[PDB]
Structures are given as C-alpha cells and as structure tokens.
C-alpha cells in the first residue's frame, strides 16, 4: 500500500481512503466490521466518516458502527486515522432548527460531542467541515476548533466543499495567531468533473493541504455504467456525456483495464491529490480498490483520457489568459 | 413562520424576537413561565435572555432557577435555545455591595458564572453578557476571565449591555489583537421615545459587526397603549402616536419599528400570556408603510449619529 | 474603611492589607482566628500570607491556620481576597534541594498545589512571587502562571521584592502575548526604609501595579519600640539590630519624642504616613493582637498635618526617584 | 555535586545526567532502584529515560522500572527532574505502522499517554524529541506540546539529534507565539566525535539551550577499550564477539589516549566525562552506570580537574572542527 | 542558457553566475569588458562582485571596472542582476580600523555608498554579507538593510559563508517584522568540499534561499590540475590521488574536468549555480558548454565514490 | 588601546570615551584639534559631545565640525555621539525635553554645527517623564530611516526607563537603546542598584560620567595639604573614605586619577569612562589608566573603602 504525508503535516496516510457511507444503509454492522478489518489488513489506515451518514432516521448510524468496531479492541482505534465531519443537520430531514446545522461555535460544540459518543472514542484525528459556511467568520470557527484541540478531543482540522479562497482565508487566519490551519480539503474531483483544478486544488497546493477526492467515480458513472445497463446517471440521458462514457468504456476495453479501477488510478496521478475515497461494500470491491492503487497507467492511456475528459486548467488562464 | 437573522457578524442564527425573562419569578410563576417558554419554542423563538439578578431582592437568581427547572424537563429544550445571561450585578443583599461582589473583576466573573451555571442547571452559557460597562476593569483583565471560560467550554460568546460605543470599539480591538472573538452583541436601551443609542452605540456596533438587542422596546409600556389604557409634553407626544388612522396596535408597532432600524437584531419581548406572545409574533411580521415611518419620525425624532447630532 | 482599586485592575481592596506572618510563630491559631474575624468585621477584605510562613519545621502553619479559618464557613473565603506566595524553600532550612526554591515552572507547579491543600481552597486570588529570580526568564514564568490561570487555580499574579526594571520586563513580556501582567508589587517601604522610592514605586506607578508595603513598622521598630524596650517582634530581628546602631537609635528617639509632643501613637502614624505616599495601595499591617488591629484601623482614619509630615520627612528623608536620587 | 542552570531557563540540574538505558536490559529492577537511590544521595537530580529503552519486546521496561521506583514514595518523584523521549517505534521492531513513530501530533499524543502510564506519574518534566522529523512542521509540533503544557502533563520540551538550524527554527517559531522553546539539546558529543561543534552547539548556545552529551564514551571506546581486550588472559580462548576497534586511524588515537592517561595516572572513563564538562555550552554528559560501583566512578569524574597540559594533549589526539563556516571555508 | 528562480523569490537568474574576482588583478579593463559583453551574449544576467575585489591597494578596482562597463550604455545596467558584498576591510590591509570591517550599521552605511559610487549606479540588485558577523545582532543588521531598501539603493539581501543556523535566525528575524529575508547564500561547495551539505544547504532549502557555489573548481584544482603541471593542496598524497582518479575517469569518458565540476554542481539539490571565473573568452565558452553538459548516472556515481559527501546532520555524525 | 562591543550591538568602541565638554578658554580651537588628533593616534575612536556644550551653546559641536572639515578621514574614523534634551536658547515650550518636535529641531541644528550628514550615536540627555516611548521612537525612527542617525542612546535614565524603552522598541522591530551614560564612580555606586542591572539585561553599553566624582578621586586631599587654593571634604566620614583611598594608593605607588578610571573598567557591563582631557599630558594619563591592571588585592581594598549597595531588591530589602 502506498503512503503519503497528508499535505504538509507530519501525518501519514494511505492513498486509499476508506469511506464509510455504505456502513449501515447498505452493509450491516458485522459486514462493515469485516470490511474495516480487511482494509486494515491491506494497510489502509485512513477512515473517513460523517455524523450524517446513515440517512434519515438513522443519521449517526455509521459513526455507531465504527464505534462498535473500535470497541472490539485489538488496537483498531490506535491504528486508524479517524476522520469525521460537522455541518450537516442531525435532526429530522428537512429545514434545520437554527444552529443545528452549519459552522457556528454552538453547532460545533454539540456536533463533536455527539460524534465522540457515537464513535465511542475520546478523540477524532481529523475533524472536517462538511461545507463552507459563508456566515461564520474564521475567528469564531478557529476559537471553536481550538477549544477542542486543547482539550485533546481533536488533533487536526480539515475542510470539504470549500472554494480555493476559503482555504486561503482559513489558514491565513489560523497562522496569524499560531494555530495549525486546515490540513486537507475533500473536494468532488473525477474525470467527468475537473473544475476543482481551477482554484480549489491550486489553493490547496499553495497552503500545503492534502486533497481527498470524493465521488471519484462520479456516482458510478465511471465504473462501467453503460455495460451494466446492458445486463446521478441522468448523465446517460444527455448524449454528449453518454458518448463520453462510451469512448471511455471502449478505450479501456482495448487496453484491458477495469473502468472502476482506472478512475481511481487516474486521480492518483493528479498533482496534489492525496487519494480518493473508496466505498466498497464487499471484500471483492475492496481488493479491486487495492489493485487500482497498484495500477500504472501508460502515457498512452493518460493522453487519451485527457482527450475524452478535458480539464479547464488553473484560473485565471482557464477563462482569461 | 418566525424571522431569523445572523447575530451581527457571527455564525449564530437568532430569532428577531428575544424572549425576555425578567417576569419569570416576580410576575409569572414557575408553571406559567415554563409554559411561555414552551410556547416561545413552538413559535420558533430560540433566543432567551436572562440575568443573574433577575427575580430581585431576596429572590435574585430565581429567574435562572426557573429556566433550569425548564431545562431539567428534557425534550431538547436546552439543545434548542441560545441561552444568554448576565454578569455585573450584586447578587448579595441589596444596597452597597461587598467589594468585588459586583462589577467585572476577574474575581466577580469567576464567582458569577459558577453561581449562574448551577442555577441554570446547564454546563454552558451560549451568550454571556456584561450587564453594564465597568470603567474600572481593563479589557485585558476581562478578556482573560472570559477566555478561561471559553477554553473550558463554559461559555461560547460574549456580549455587552449598556456600553458606550467607544467601549465596544476598545473591547473588540483588544480581543482581535490576540486572536479572540470580541463582543458579538450589544443590548442597549432603544425605542421610539429614547433614540440616543443612535448617536454612537449603534454606529459602533455596526462598525464592529455586533448584533444590537433593544431592551425596554416599549419604553416601560408607554408605547403599548397607555392613554388609551408618566408629562404635559410626554402625553401629547404619545397622543400623536396613538392616532387608528392607519389601523395598528401600538405595542406591536413599537416592536416592528425597531425591526426596521439598521443594525438592530430585534427587541427583548416580555410576554406574560401565550396571547401576548402571539401578538409579539405578529409584530415581527408587520410591514410598516413608508407612510407611517415618516410620521413616526416626526412624533419621535432621533438625534442621528455623532458628530452630526451636535456639530456638523 | 477606605477602599481603592489595586493599581490599574478592577479588583477593589481595603487600604489596609491584613498580614499573617505572625499567625503561628508568635500568635496562636485561635487568636489568629479572632484577628481575622475582626479584620473582616472592620471591612478589610485583603489577606496576605506565604507558603513559608510558620518558619522552620512549621513552614506552612500559617496557610493551615487560614485554612481552618475558612473551614468555619460564614462566607469567609468568598469575602476575602486571598494572596499567598511562591519562591521559598518549603523543606529543611538551609541550602535547598535544586528546584525546591525559586521560580522555575517546576517549583511553581509543586508550590501552588501544596498551598491550595494547606489553605483548603480551590483557588488563590493573588499569587505572588516572593522575590525576583534572575535565573528564570519571563516566558518560562508566564507559561507556568498561564497554566494556573487557565485551570482556574489563580486569578492574578503579583510580585514581591522586585526591582523596577523587573516589573517593566515582566509586564512588557506578558502584554506582548495578551496576558494580564503583574497587578501589584509588595515591597519594603516605611519611614526607616524609603529606597523603594528610587525605581520600584515609579515603575509600579508607570505600569499600573498596586503597591503594598511590607513591614510597614519596620518589624515593630516604628511602633513604640524604645518606650517598650524592657517589656514582641520589636525585641528581635530588624527592630532590635536597628536599636543597637546609635544613629538609627537616635532617629527613632526623635520619632517617639515628636509624637509624644503631638499626642499621637507611633504605630498608627507609621501606617498613616504610608497611606499618604503616592501610588501606595496600603501597608500590610502585622498585628500580633486584636488590639493592634483595632489600632491599625484607627490609623486608617488619621489625618496627619503638614507640620507632622514635614518633621517626619526631616527625621526620615527619602531619596526620591532615580536618576535624580544619585545624579540630577 | 556541581549544579548548573539548564541553558537559559530556571531549571537547575546536576552536571551529571543519570541515563537509564541499562535499567532492564543489563541491570535488573532491584539494582536499578539502588542505583537511582545512590544517584539521589550523590546529588544527581536529573534522570534521562526514553519510551524505547528496554529493547525489542521489552520496549518501555525502563520507564516501568522508574515507575516502580517512584511508587516507593520517599519524595523520589518530587526530587527528580524526569526526562523521557518521543519519536521511536514502540511496536515490533522493523518498519513502523504509519504514525506509530516520528513526531506527528498523533504520535505525540499516544506516546506521552503511554509514557505517563508506564512512568506511574502525572507529568514529565522534560519531554524530548528523540530525533529531528523533517516531515512535521513546527506549528504542528508546537500545537501538540502546547496541549501537553496547558494540561500540565509536561513542563519543558527538549530535542535530541537535531541540526543547529532545526534548533533555531523550532525556537523562533515558538517565540512568535509566546511559547517557551526547546530548553535542551541531546547530541552525540565526545572526544572521538566532535562535529556537533560545527553548528549544533553554536545554535544551542545562541538560543540558550542546555547541551547534554550522549554516548560520552563513544560506545565505550574511550573507556579503556584497548586494555580491556587484553584483560581476561585464558578467558580469551572462550567460544566471544569479534573485537570492534579495527579502524587503524581510530585505534591509534585510542592507544595514544590510553598511553597519555597511563602517563598521568588517570582513568579513561573518568577523563572522557570530565573533558565534556570543560566544553563551552555543555551542561553535562549522560552517564549510564550498570552498578553502584560505576556510579561512584562517574561522580569522581565530575570532581576531576584536568590540567591544561592534558587538555592540550587530548586536543592534539582528538582535534575538533571549528564552528562553521570556518570549519570548511573561512 | 538555462534559467532558474533564485530560491523562493521572483528574481530569475542564469544557472551560471559570472564571477568578477579576476577582473583587475588578472584581466584588465578592456578584456573584462569583453568577457562581460560575451556573458550577456550567452544569456548570463547574474554578475557577482565585491568591494574588496582588486586586492591590496587596488581594492574597489573590480567594482570600478563594472562601473566603466555600465557607463558604455547599451542597456548593460538594465540587463544585469548586479550583486556585490559588504563586510571586508576596504582600507589598508592588516588589522582593520574598528567598524571599518564586519556588519555594524556603521560599516554597512559607508560600505554601500562607496560601492555605489564605484559601480556608477544608483542601486545594487543583490547586496550580500561576505561572511557572518557573530557580534552584530540581526535587529541591527535588518535595520541597516531596511534603510537601504526603502531608499531604493538595494533590492535583495543575500549571505555568504554563513552557518545554516545563521540563515534560519536571519530569516526568522526578518519575517517577524515584515521584511524579505536572505534570498541567497554563497557557500564553498564543490566536489572536493561538500560539508555545506551537512547544514548550510539544508537550511537554505528550508528557508527558500538560492545556493550559489563559490570556488566551484576548488581553486582550479578540479580544472585539470595534474595535466596542467590553495589549489597547491596537491602535495597531500591523499587528495592528489582523488584528483588523479578524477582526471583519469574523465579522460576515459571523454569529458573536460573544468566542465564536469561545474555540471556536477548543477545537479545538486537546491543549488542555483556555480560562480565561474573566466579570464578569457575561451574559458567562458567552456563554462557555457558545462551548463549544457548532461552527466550520465555512471559518471555521477563514480564521482560520488571518489568524492563522498557527508550527508545532512544529524545523520552525518550521529544517526 | 582596548576595544569592546558597545553592549549587544556590532559597533566596536574604545574603552576610553573622549568627552568634549572641557573644551574651553584654556583650550584653543587649535589645541582642541590637537587633543582630538592625539586621541585618534592613541586609538580612541569614540567621541562624545552634546548640543548644549559651550550661553555659547553649540560651540563644542562647532569645534568638532571644523576638526572634521580638515579632512584626513577624521569623520570616517570616529564614532560620533551627541545629545538632545537641553535648552539651546526657563525654556520656551518644546525647546527642551524629548518631544518629537524638539528632537527634529535639535538634530537639524546639531548636524549643521557638527558639519556632518549623520550622527553615529544620538543620545537622550535625560529621561523625559512626559513623553511616551511610541512618540520618541517615531521621531528616532524617522531619523534612522533618513540616514541621519544610526544608533540611539540614553543618559541619566532609571533602569526601568531602559526596560520600557527597549521593550517598546522591540515590539515593532526597532533597535532599542544601545548605551546608557550614567554617573558612576567609586564614591557614587548607586547606579549598581538598578541602572547597570537593567542595562546588562537589555544589552546596553554603560558609559560612566563624572568618573573622578568631580575631582574628589583625583588626589583632592593631597592637593588640599599642598596648599594654595563639590566639597565633601568637610564631611568627616566622606573625608575619611578619600583619606583611606589616598593612603591605599600611596602604599601601592598608584595615581588617584588613574585608579578611578581603571576601577570602572573592571566593573561588570561598563563600556568605559568619559574622559575630558584639557591637555595632552592629561590624555596620556588617561591612556595609561586604561592600560593599568589593578591587582585583586587592590580591588578588594577599594571595596572595603567604597562598599557598593548591591542590586535591588537586596540593596534595601533581601
Ligand atoms: N514579601 C516579603 O518579603 C515580606 C512580607 N511581609 C508581609 O508583611 C506583613 C507585615 O510585616 P510585619 O513585619 O509583621 O509588619 P510590622 O513592621 O508592622 O511588624 C509587626 C510588629 O509591629 C508591631 N505592631 C503592629 N501593629 C501595630 C500597631 N497598630 N501599633 C503598634 N505596634 C504595632 C507589633 O510588634 P510587637 O509584637 O513588638 O508589639 C508587630 O508584631 C507580614 O504579615 C507579611 O504578610 C513581611 C515580611 C517580608
């Protein structure tokens, strides 16, 4: 298994990040524990979850399943870098009660509290914002994170679904008063959606953040979608995206490569990318993700992939000069 | 149903009505207070204002005790409310305080928040407010004491009440020097009869991004139907105000008028019945015409900002 | 009773500070308790003690006597601003085991924990360095004090037996990172010893520290020691050595004669004088009896005339501030 | 016993530092306790240990031996400046599991908690990085140490096996935000290996760190190793490690050393220690007695006064470099 | 001509730095002028000088030659990144009058004004400390350099012959009060002398300084010294043997010693480039060829075994 | 000639400081110039003057100016120190003391008289309790940045003034005071209570003025007994100190004036004494005093005769 520093910090993580979103709604408790044991066996030490995972009435269920996993002992907690998230509404689906979503110091205090209890652990290694909150200023956010840092309840802070300039503002404000800033950004990044390349990834590289790609298969659209319908994806409605996926599936047919694996290995070549979040439901899907991390894509396949799935390049050049 | 706003520049979202709490104890009883709070919650009011001195005399603290009773019932009550209380007041025998048993020394702040947390039956206050400026305590002392509480998780935010504008500036410049969040709100005396917050308090609050909470929004009930059930000048000002020509109830218009003022978060309302609360709710939905605002401005003129209020 | 702000900070204190050094080695526990009750009854809210007080094998006795006073209830702890000290050796008298005296963060951690236990309280209001430690830098000291402030174990930090430039360096270092600095300096200052006037008091005034004067009667020398010489702290220590030096002896003789003539008591005048000195918060009185405490209270109501102030200045000239004190 | 301040800070330490490496592997629990009690009686108040001490499956055994020492009472914990270390892999020897070695905030947090539990104490006086970690930035390290300071789990932070410029960067970063920086550096420094003089000791002195010399006898090569080879007579026929001092350049240095010391009547183990005590900016050497007898010998080396003739001749045998840049440029 | 950034800053410099030490005491005005025009022609934009160059009673002569060169117009001044130095005694050789050497604000002020006058220009681009001064604190030094920056007499500050920790202290002090720190360090670094790798180069890399290698041929000892029979170190059998293995190997691969020593430096991590000291047009052309040379990995490997480096501290002496 | 760093900074100065106050009517312009050339010849590079030196105020600075105008590298070799604070005209408001207004006009008048474009060391002549340091540092920082001055020094400060000044300077990157001129000699040692300990903490040079205590340490009892024309020689106890001092020096064959200067050079943190020779034989006597080595026996005896106070707080408390 390949390891890398998470951006600029001393933390070392697996380039494959185990996502936990399916633990609860798809795989049951014991099945999820087995997948986590097997991720560990393959050397994956980086586990991403969220308070909202579980969905609907079951929000928090994913954290509970990792909690019972840690409760089996055998150094599981000691060995994993535990990441979870704050921002999302934990009450009834629909419009949240005020301050029961987003990034106020008040929601941060109550959110991390409920996460620690469901996770059955006394600390979170990587506490991430699930989305930028334009209404909370960074001196409030860093006050609330710093309370947690100094109680030993969290080690590191990261973001998800930020703009590039939010990364810059967040870390400049942290650095002004001697605080470690964001250590990582979780952005939607895959062959079909490359616009994090304009500004999010350049800002992250500048400020030394790890870049973790969520929806690395674009919701399955890059995992052999077309071949599976012959045996969201309202993209296979639009014939331009459909023809794009077709050329992709055809291209990988002639190089003998699995699309679900190629999509992951492609992200691993991109400058600044720490790795994709993989969400296997079975032992075969985990082993396939591991193979994707050992794949070496030829220049030939990389060039043709860029021809099918062009990227915008960095701003300002992407739209001006 | 209820209108919400950010509290000044910060991430906290509050209802534009602030549930006052001073009646709980003296006027309404524990059972009636509990039921008004349950009602406020169901109308969407999340912002409750209280003070340690509330209850008065030998009953100072009774109000905080009543809110603790309410929280102890469970049912997401503590979780749903932005709880604001106050420090400054003597909690001992009325009359001259023993030294450091009132005002804002780090010593009185330590003893006040401990006694407030115990009576409130909660491990934290969301918004801990100075009841009054203390000219004798410097801001590096006050911010030390508040930072001890912030870092213990005992409080989240700091607000002020009865500050001058320049105290607001000094307090927040001092906090920002060393990374700390400053005052997030100022609770000032603001209503149609008393507009001198407009000279400097409200302008400083808006420059520093504080929410403005208006206490005594009906000027002691003088703006809520007085001569239609104290003087020769005061009466005929109110009489022009209380003149049906436009079809509106005075008490609700005094609240709604404050909601039009730039920088104002909302007023502190103090309902004693669920029907008074339902009126306050409608006050927050009212739209006053450019008509009625221009006329209110001639009955109750305001000073404007300094320096123009008194120079040019 | 007159109250004042302690220097620039919001803490209000009585202009008389109750000293406790006598409680244990010269005044027993029960009468210590009576004096403290009388002090509280007269409006004195500011008590000074030290870990070392008690002396010898009884170092810590004074704190323990304060502890059992608080334990009697009646709001005593809540009403009193409690000050103690760190620096002194709490082990066997003589050369200290390394880091069991002075102001390292290590001695600070162990010293405050033992003080809180002997005082039977969870916080000290005013925690004072007993003496400057030239070997500990201020970033180490402010680290250790800041740990205590953030845990709630102390509120304020003060100094004792500092030079003026130590006050400056300390508070400039604290302010650089937004810490409240020293709030008070407890220095030797009385009619017989006025050299804190050169730099310590000017620096304290500049930086807004309170100034509380220790041994305000010079160990009882200024309390009628000559009249009382054959019948007591004045029979020992500072006072007794001063009485054997003829010039100091003469100074005190002129002092007791001047007060005989004006119908005033020496102990009370010595305290009243300190109360006139600019920047002085108050003297730390050292009653051995309840009588002497009621006497200090009378001192706090005395008004000295210009005539008396000028004659005292003639007997007990002071240097005034540096650089003028020794240059121009 | 001679005391000194540890660099610029208020902490006072004996100029002999009691190393504990041999407690567990070569000395057993009860003799380790007796050595620590005899160190205290000689005035030594400065104990240096490490989480890794113990070796192999027994990593942490040394910290446990100190813990049972402290648990005897008698003001033992109160009298000792306790130092330990973080950086080393505490699991099975070999490649470490990610973040189970080096200086991430994650490993600092788990390493100190495990050391406090083994040491049977609620705080460490001097918590030292065993080695520079080029992959962890100083705002991450200082955040982790600052959490421990503010919780009261540690008092002072030190380094070991740093470059001079790591010392400067660490303490400049700490000073920016009012944090006390490194108070001490533990570098390899002895007659045979003097290259710490180029930049490590200069930087430590500029920034006011104490300098603690580890391996002051260069693994025993300055402790009379050549005489010790010809020691047993017939015992050398036994079925015994190969002799380790083969580099002829260094072997002749050691011969000249032992001859010089024979000429002047001095003990090689004592001189190596006392020499370090003359070097500018050095606090003291770490002494690793395996017996009460070895301790008395180190204590004698602390009271030894080396004549200027012997100091001159030792310098001729073991020349140091200058400070940089002069050592290699001008 | 290969260009690079000078460490972390926006200044772009050729990977060859034109030294001017020989201008005066070896080449005279007219020929140094030709060497400088030819350096411009090959794309070299980075000229290194010093106030002391010229030697003895001719100290300042080199700067005077650059001044007479710039006075010929033709965009010479505009095209060149001009670097000079302060620290050296500019008076009578031997013991210096107090404050007429080293880095006091006193010596800095008189030193830069005399340099500017001799260079015939109103600004120096890169003003370098010739050597660390352990007796002048960095708040004094940065005060003096900041005066020169704000008056527009200098743009960047650099160092020469610092220890690694001096680089760190210098730039941490500058950054605390909003000053650009050192942008480059000039160290003795070549195949024969690699101890800059212990700490100096690693500190420069951490703080983003360019690394300029001076005496890259070790006094000419690496430019074919034994065939063409300070660099007189040849007496020592140990080093003369290094040099013969060196010349022998490059004879076998068909390579010129003076060009390999330069090209080797261009492969070292964090190195900006060597300062070359041509006395003729032939030597400049040679250095240019050196900047174009690609050393194979078996030559770099054999050069390593002949000229081992220490590696970085602490590993170099401990672990 | 012995040199030293001026406190913590990179400036190197001779441990004798040539004062210019005693340039007067027994001292030509021409004889002042000769003395200054002789000082340069002896290796003294540190010249101290003041604007008020000279009702004929500024004349001293003018004499230095014409000295510099002779050329011969005189300006370039000398570390030139002058002062601001004194009235140069009861003073008209802001024509004395340390306001930015008086600093600006004083330095301009000083540079004109001195006939130079810069002062190396510009010193406050006295503490000004009414001007805050952020004002003072603004005005000095303007001069630093214009190149008109290099370093700032103090004179007749309290130790806590030194601390406050340099802490304030360092907050915003500025070089603080580099030197303090204080009254300091065997008879007056109270600068050891706080001034010198602060100066040493903050790394200032200490320049001792009135090093002979107005001549009291220059053999004043011998001169009285020899007959023919401050007086503490009427004070019995102060007289006995000076008598013990002159007896001690007679027994060891040492000159009172020279020993007073040599003693100061042994004191911790002292850069040197100001000397104001009116003749060239007085200068050579000062140079010999800087060469003298006082035995430890003599230094112990001088401490018995002239006990120091110790540092505060120990000086008066414990
Ligand atoms: N920080 C430091 O270094 C020090 C601090 N302190 C603090 O200062 C306090 C006071 O010091 P202390 O030396 O006791 O003070 P004093 O100088 O007042 O000496 C006390 C003695 O003065 C006499 N006395 C006290 N009050 C009166 C009165 N009203 N009328 C007449 N005589 C009186 C009594 O002498 P007699 O018994 O002879 O009648 C008494 O024992 C101490 O309690 C301690 O807290 C003290 C010493 C050092």
Numbering used by the authors:
A (entry chain F): 1 to 231, 242 to 331
B (entry chain D): 0 to 228, 246, 248 to 260, 263 to 331
C (entry chain H): 1 to 231, 235 to 331
D (entry chain B): 1 to 239, 241 to 331
E (entry chain E): 1 to 229, 242 to 331
F (entry chain A): 1 to 54, 56, 58 to 91, 95 to 234, 243 to 331
Paste lines from the article:
Aldo-keto reductases (AKRs) are a superfamily of oxidoreductases capable of reducing carbonyl to primary and secondary alcohols, found in all phyla. In this work, we identify the enzyme AKRtyl, which is responsible for tylosin reduction. Phylogenetic analysis indicates that AKRtyl is the founding member of subfamily D within family 12 in the AKR superfamily. Specifically, by combining steady-state and transient kinetics, X-ray crystallography and molecular dynamics simulation, we demonstrate that AKRtyl exhibits a positive synergy mediated by an unusual Monod-Wyman-Changeux (MWC) paradigm of allosteric regulation at low concentrations of the cofactor NADPH, but an inhibitory effect at high concentrations is observed.
We solved two AKRtyl crystal structures in the purified state. They differ in space group and asymmetric unit with resolution of 2.30 and 2.32 Å, respectively. Each structure contains cofactor NADP(H) carried from E. coli purification and we confirmed that the cofactor is in the oxidized state. The first structure contains a complete octamer in the asymmetric unit in which two subunits are bound with NADP(H) and belong to different tetramers. Of the remaining six NADP(H) free subunits, a long cofactor-binding loop (approximately residues 230–241) are not fully observed in five subunits in the electron density map due to disorder, whereas this region is visible only in one subunit that presents an open state. In addition, a large cleft suitable for NADPH binding was formed above the TIM barrel in all these cofactor-free subunits. Cofactors are indeed bound in this cleft as demonstrated in the two subunits that contain NADP(H). The nicotinamide ring on NADP(H) is π-π stacked against Trp214, and the carboxamide group makes contact with Ser160, Asn161, Gln186, and Trp331 which comes from neighboring subunit’s C-terminal tail loop. To summarize, the eight subunits in the first purified state structure all belong to the active conformations, while the second structure contains half active and half dormant conformations which coincidentally camped based on conformational states to form tetramers. Upon further analysis, in both structures, we found that the dormant tetramers have no NADP(H) bound but the active tetramers bound at least one NADP(H).
